[PDB]
């Protein structure tokens, strides 16, 4: 199971904390799952290689300061923009044991 608050609320210009705690997680991914246009990967916290934000968020996406791992797949969406508002979804792909995913909402 993945632990994520259903709703996350960030005021403008704040580092919204996207939570994704698994109960070891090999990799976490976050994406913006909203619609055809709003179907974009946001960041990939791969445990062995680090965070790899996507081209449109390389600056507004960063993981919490050490040491939050293990099993913490949190990523903070700072300087949140009114547009950022939208449902996201974690995928915690726990290995040596399988796969998962959880939705979320951010309401800026």
């Amino acid at each position, epitope marked *: 199971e993945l632990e994520t608050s259903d709703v996350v609320t960030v005021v403008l210009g704040q580092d919204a904390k996207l939570p994704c705690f698994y109960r070891q997680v090999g990799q976490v991914a976050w994406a913006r799952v909203d619609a055809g246009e709003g179907a974009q990967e946001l960041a990939l916290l791969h445990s062995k*290689y680090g965070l790899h934000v996507s*081209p449109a*968020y390389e600056g507004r996406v960063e993981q919490p300061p050490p040491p939050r791992n293990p099993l913490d797949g949190s990523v903070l969406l700072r300087n949140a923009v009114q547009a950022d508002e939208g449902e996201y979804e974690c995928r915690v792909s726990t290995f040596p044991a399988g796969s998962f995913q959880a939705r979320l909402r951010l309401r800026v």
Partner: antibody
Framework: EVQLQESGPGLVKPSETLSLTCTVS????????VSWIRQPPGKGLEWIGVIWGGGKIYYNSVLKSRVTISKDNSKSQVSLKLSSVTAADTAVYYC?????????????WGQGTLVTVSS | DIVMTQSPDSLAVSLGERATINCKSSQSLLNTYSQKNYLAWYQQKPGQPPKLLIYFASTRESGVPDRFSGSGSGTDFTLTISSLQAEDVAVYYC?????????FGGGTKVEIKR
């Protein structure tokens, strides 16, 4: 060492389903992503979809509703299945490895395969 | 869907001369936060799979000779093969790798005036 081999049926009856396969080798399909591009003979490249190492699949809007990418991390195999293959689906299909984790420029490519929808 | 429009469609240049293959995007390929522009130039020579040349508009890729000096920003970008030695007679495609669905442009076929 990063080698992608694309093998599939070549001649497909109209209204059928192509089913090429891309045997990746030398890179862990668990970490890197592979996408499928096609290039209609004598035309521009087209994107079909990307299967990121975690199994999230992104498809082009146009060929969607008619495509399916999947992989087997175990056998280093990625596969394309396009439904209702029709006149326009004739092309050289390509599988390329995404350059890096969540990087959208396809650094390594496959040689290609001409699927020919025909009667 | 970012629309990438290369221009011109076809280009003829002598061996020594500069080539420029402009490319345009309905959407900017710029991350202000990162100050990176994400546009990649490929090189589909006759009968071969496309080969990336320049990611990040400017950053080339190991092996790509310096003649291929890519540049540009926003929605206006540009490839420049400084001296079009003959082998560089392929079709060059600009791809936006800013987001999905990746989109390539038409391709500017370059040629040589002997």
């Amino acid at each position: 060492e990063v080698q992608l081999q694309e093998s599939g049926p070549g001649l497909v009856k109209p209204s059928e389903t192509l089913s090429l396969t891309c045997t990746v080798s030398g890179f862990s399909l668990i970490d890197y992503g592979v996408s499928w591009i096609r290039q209609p003979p004598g035309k521009g490249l087209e994107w079909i979809g990307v299967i990121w190492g975690g199994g999230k699949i992104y498809y082009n809007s146009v060929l969607k509703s008619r495509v399916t990418i999947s992989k087997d991390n175990s056998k280093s195999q990625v596969s394309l299945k396009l439904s209702s293959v029709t006149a326009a689906d004739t092309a050289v299909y390509y599988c390329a490895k995404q350059g890096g984790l969540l990087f959208y420029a396809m650094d390594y490519w496959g040689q290609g395969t001409l699927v020919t929808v025909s009667s | 869907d970012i629309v990438m429009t290369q221009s011109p469609d076809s280009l003829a240049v002598s061996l020594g001369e500069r080539a420029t293959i402009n490319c345009k995007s309905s959407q900017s390929l710029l991350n202000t936060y990162s100050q990176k522009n994400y546009l990649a130039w490929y090189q589909q020579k006759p009968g071969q799979p496309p080969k990336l040349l320049i990611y990040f508009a400017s950053t080339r890729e190991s092996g790509v000779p310096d003649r291929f000096s890519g540049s540009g920003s926003g929605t206006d970008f540009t490839l420049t093969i400084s001296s079009l030695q003959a082998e560089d007679v392929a079709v060059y495609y600009c791809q936006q790798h800013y987001n999905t669905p990746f989109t390539f442009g038409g391709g500017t076929k370059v040629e040589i005036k002997r």
